[PDB]
């Protein structure tokens, strides 16, 4: 259930069909440090992806 590096429980997410169009989200999560004035500890990942 909560296993697999894309978290196989993410197949069941409500937004699973509107996340298929979100590409390059890791790069923009990393670049988010240049837009918000706060350090993000989870800069490397995204909970919905």
């Amino acid at each position: 259930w909560d296993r697999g590096i894309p978290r196989i429980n993410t197949l069941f997410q409500k937004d699973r069909h509107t996340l298929a169009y979100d590409k390059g989200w890791r790069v923009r999560t990393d670049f988010k440090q240049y837009q918000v004035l706060k350090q993000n500890p989870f800069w490397w990942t995204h909970q919905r992806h």
Partner: protein, 352 residues
């Protein structure tokens, strides 16, 4: 040549008007020869017209580049023609023209066209030089306001004092506006809507942020002075001096140091208030809604899972924790919906 040699019933201004009509005739011949050069050259390097929109710069570039596109690299003569950014852009584009060579007789014909265009350019320079020398007689006030080269150029592009007099100030401000293709930049080229008036020394001798405000004023006063001169009134130059004095006074007013402004102390650390439709609406907006009331709470001893990695401690209250809330899901209050300001809306409407 006779006028310049004799510069020590057939008046002077008939010669002036004939010369100034010759200027627009020369400009028309220049634009048709530019059409020919562009049409017969856009089979070797067809993209250059989209990179160098200026007619004379395009003519100089095709005379310099010719059929050999190795002269875009290690070539100083282009730096005498174009900006460095557009030089590197045309080098980049010439690396990938996808255009076949030119025939030798085609090269001869295009070189002849370029040489004739340069001859016409030199003739235009000489005739504008003569007009600039005769400025003080032909247009005293317009020369008083803005030098002599600027007045000569603006009436040469307009087509004489008579043609310039029937022109509004908002177009005299744009006499000499070049297309100025933006190569990566953000229309920070100082020539998006500027002409010979903006680059006149009277406008250029201001801080760069007041220069367009100064150019509008200078164009308006130059329109006034040109209308004054078109009937050859104020021969001595009183009107031009008055307009220049007004321009200088308005320029000093802009650069006048800001007034002394007082510091407002903190009022006091310490009355009845009304209530009505406005008070009810503002209280409902700031009121604690049921969904926001329910997020304030937190179950005792029932440990929630830490959703939202990015910030631990963020927790909804009894919103979904199956704690002590209600059976149905809470509904969003319409009064809390985010809306935009009045000024922001009016700017969003002027944008349309």
């Amino acid at each position: 040549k006779q006028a310049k040699a004799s510069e020590v019933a057939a008046p002077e201004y008939r010669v002036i008007v004939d010369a100034n009509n010759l200027t627009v005739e020369i400009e028309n011949e220049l634009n048709i020869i530019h059409k020919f050069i562009r049409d017969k050259y856009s089979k070797r390097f067809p993209e250059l017209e989209s990179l160098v929109p200026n007619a004379l710069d395009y003519i100089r570039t095709v005379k310099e580049l010719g059929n050999s596109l190795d002269k875009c690299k290690n070539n100083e003569n282009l730096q005498q023609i174009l900006t460095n950014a557009t030089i590197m852009v045309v080098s980049v584009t010439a690396s990938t023209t996808q255009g076949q060579q030119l025939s030798e007789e085609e090269l001869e014909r295009l070189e002849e066209a370029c040489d004739m265009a340069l001859e016409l350019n030199a003739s235009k320079h000489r005739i504008y030089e003569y007009v600039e020398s005769r400025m003080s007689f032909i247009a005293p006030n317009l020369s008083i306001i803005i030098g002599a080269s600027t007045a000569a150029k603006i009436m040469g592009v307009a087509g004489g004092l008579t043609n310039l007099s029937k022109m509004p100030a908002c177009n005299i401000m744009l006499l000499g506006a070049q297309r100025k293709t933006l190569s990566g930049f953000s229309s920070t080229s100082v020539l998006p809507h500027t002409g010979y008036i903006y680059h006149s020394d009277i406008v250029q001798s201001l801080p760069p942020d007041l220069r367009r405000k100064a150019a509008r004023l200078v164009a308006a006063k130059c329109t006034l002075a040109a209308r004054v001169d078109s009937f050859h009134e104020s021969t001595e130059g009183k009107v031009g001096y008055e307009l220049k004095d007004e321009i200088e006074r308005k320029f000093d007013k802009w650069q006048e140091p800001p007034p002394v402004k007082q510091v407002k102390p903190l009022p006091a650390p310490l009355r009845k208030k009304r209530g009505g439709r406005r008070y009810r609406k503002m209280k409902e907006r700031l009121g604690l809604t049921e969904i926001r009331k329910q997020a304030n709470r937190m179950s005792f001893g029932e440990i929630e899972e830490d959703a939202y990695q990015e910030d631990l401690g963020f927790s909804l209250g009894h919103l979904g924790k199956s704690g002590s809330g209600r059976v149905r899901q809470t509904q969003v209050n319409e009064a809390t919906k985010a809306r935009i300001s009045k000024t922001l809306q009016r700017t969003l409407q002027k944008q349309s």
